[PDB]
Amino acid sequence: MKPYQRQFIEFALNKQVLKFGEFTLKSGRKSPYFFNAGLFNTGRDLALLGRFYAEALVDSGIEFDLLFGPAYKGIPIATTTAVALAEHHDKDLPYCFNRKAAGGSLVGSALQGRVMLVDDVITAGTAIRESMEIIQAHGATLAGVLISLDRQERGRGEISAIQEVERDYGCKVISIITLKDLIAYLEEKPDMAEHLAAVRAYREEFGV
Amino acid sequence: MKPYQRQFIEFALNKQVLKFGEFTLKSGRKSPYFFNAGLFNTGRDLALLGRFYAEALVDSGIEFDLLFGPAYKGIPIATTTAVALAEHHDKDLPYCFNRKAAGGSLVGSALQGRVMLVDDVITAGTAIRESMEIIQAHGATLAGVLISLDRQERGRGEISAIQEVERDYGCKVISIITLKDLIAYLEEKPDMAEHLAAVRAYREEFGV
Ligand SMILES: O=C(O)c1cc(=O)[nH]c(=O)n1[C@@H]1O[C@H](COP(=O)(O)O)[C@@H](O)[C@H]1O
Numbered sequence: 217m218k219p220y221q222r223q224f225i226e227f228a229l230n231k232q233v234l235k236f237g238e239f240t241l242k243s244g245r246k247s248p249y250f251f252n253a254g255l256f257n258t259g260r261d262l263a264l265l266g267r268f269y270a271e272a273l274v275d276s277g278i279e280f281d282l283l284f285g286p287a288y289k290g291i292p293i294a295t296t297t298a299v300a301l302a303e304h305h306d307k308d309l310p311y312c313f314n315r316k317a318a319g320g321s322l323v324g325s326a327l328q329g330r331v332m333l334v335d336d337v338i339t340a341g342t343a344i345r346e347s348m349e350i351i352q353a354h355g356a357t358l359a360g361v362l363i364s365l366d367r368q369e370r371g372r373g374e375i376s377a378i379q380e381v382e383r384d385y386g387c388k389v390i391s392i393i394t395l396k397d398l399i400a401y402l403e404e405k406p407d408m409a410e411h412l413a414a415v416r417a418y419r420e421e422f423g424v
Numbered sequence: 425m426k427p428y429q430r431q432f433i434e435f436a437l438n439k440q441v442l443k444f445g446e447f448t449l450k451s452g453r454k455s456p457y458f459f460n461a462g463l464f465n466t467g468r469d470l471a472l473l474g475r476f477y478a479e480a481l482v483d484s485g486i487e488f489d490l491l492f493g494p495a496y497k498g499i500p501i502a503t504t505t506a507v508a509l510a511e512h513h514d515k516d517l518p519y520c521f522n523r524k525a526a527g528g529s530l531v532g533s534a535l536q537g538r539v540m541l542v543d544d545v546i547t548a549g550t551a552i553r554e555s556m557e558i559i560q561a562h563g564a565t566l567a568g569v570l571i572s573l574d575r576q577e578r579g580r581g582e583i584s585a586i587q588e589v590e591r592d593y594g595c596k597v598i599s600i601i602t603l604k605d606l607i608a609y610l611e612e613k614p615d616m617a618e619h620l621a622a623v624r625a626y627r628e629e630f631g632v
């Protein structure tokens with residue numbers, strides 16, 4: 217666990233973006249925890265959020281030339297990560313995004329070179345295959361996918377979605393927290409035991 | 425002319441977002457200058473851009489509860505203005521935006537209370553009437569419209585678009601530069617004389 221990961225969880229908790237209960241995923245499973253980046257609905261949330269993203273980006277070491285935000289749910293993030301990156305790390309990079317309009321119609325820079333794709337959480341090895349249609353549809357390569365939370369569980373097969381993503385676009389997914397950190401984290405909060413025993417239990421059944 | 429307006433022009437120039445030549449507006453007129461916020465395609469541009477917006481916001485004194493970014497061209501701005509506002513002024517505000525999808529489907533906070541709408545440049549007393557459909561379609565009032573550049577010229581009538589906007593949504597449009605500052609600015613650059621005599625000439629024919 218690296219520090220920014222520690223405050224992220226925290227950041228994430230207080231926000232309630234990270235919640236402990238009894239959810240029912242889009243898959244039909246019944247996870248004990250849910251992560252919902254949508255609850256980042258304010259300036260500061262956005263401000264911080266992009267501070268975490270830039271770190272994991274930076275602290276990753278992958279190389280990329282350009283940020284890319286998918287659809288709608290990508291725009292606020294790619295914009296914030298872009299500002300974090302220049303205010304905070306002195307990295308000046310070009311962002312753009314795609315117009316989901318009855319076409320590609322990118323908004324912002326080129327779509328030239330090594331795209332770094334950015335999003336919130338992959339569950340269903342999804343829009344990436346749309347998103348990544350564009351990138352590959354304009355003669356730019358894909359460098360990777362930066363996300364918030366790797367739920368680290370099984371899909372319909374033995375592997376996970378992230379894994380499938382790595383396994384299909386010859387790309388590398390980076391990400392801020394993972395299940396593992398999530399647990400690691402609960403081990404320090406003695407009074408999160410109930411959530412622990414539970415997420416501990418869960419990863420057993422489904423953890424990849 | 426207030427300082428941030430001075431660096432904005434500058435910022436705007438070096439960027440070439442502000443260009444001096446011979447354009448032909450969407451109206452059919454032949455302006456001597458063009459402003460094209462689209463050339464803000466990088467992290468820093470976005471970073472700065474939202475620093476200017478927050479100022480004019482702040483330095484305005486209007487009150488609002490929430491930021492609002494229209495369509496696509498609004499998302500990167502409302503996101504940046506939101507971060508500026510919290511990093512820089514300690515104003516924590518809730519942003520959201522609208523999903524242009526075959527509906528309202530806002531993305532982010534409420535659409536509750538006093539919206540502050542944010543955009544790049546109004547020319548054709550436009551999407552505001554779409555944008556402002558939403559706001560008024562959800563029981564939020566409109567506090568205003570914050571923009572970059574008031575071109576300060578005539579529409580089909582004696583008044584300008586901004587004026588018509590004020591004149592139709594009982595709202596107040598704020599904005600960073602105006603033609604006037606634009607000129608004021610050229611008066612200090614002795615070797616911008618040609619652009620001066622020209623934009624001076626232009627405002628005469630069309631200036632409101
Ligand atoms: O249902 C889940 O898989 C899910 C787990 C989780 O930990 N977080 C989470 O965001 N999700 C869902 O993942 C969605 C976004 O991801 P994609 O299918 O990759 O677009 C959602 O509708 C979330 O609710």
Ligand SMILES: O=C(O)c1cc(=O)[nH]c(=O)n1[C@@H]1O[C@H](COP(=O)(O)O)[C@@H](O)[C@H]1O
Pocket residue numbers: 448449450451457458459460461545546547548549550551575
């Ligand atoms: O054609 C113009 O009116 C125009 C003048 C100008 O100074 N800046 C400018 O952005 N425009 C146009 O205004 C558009 C965006 O404004 P709305 O019609 O309010 O959406 C554009 O397509 C610009 O090119």
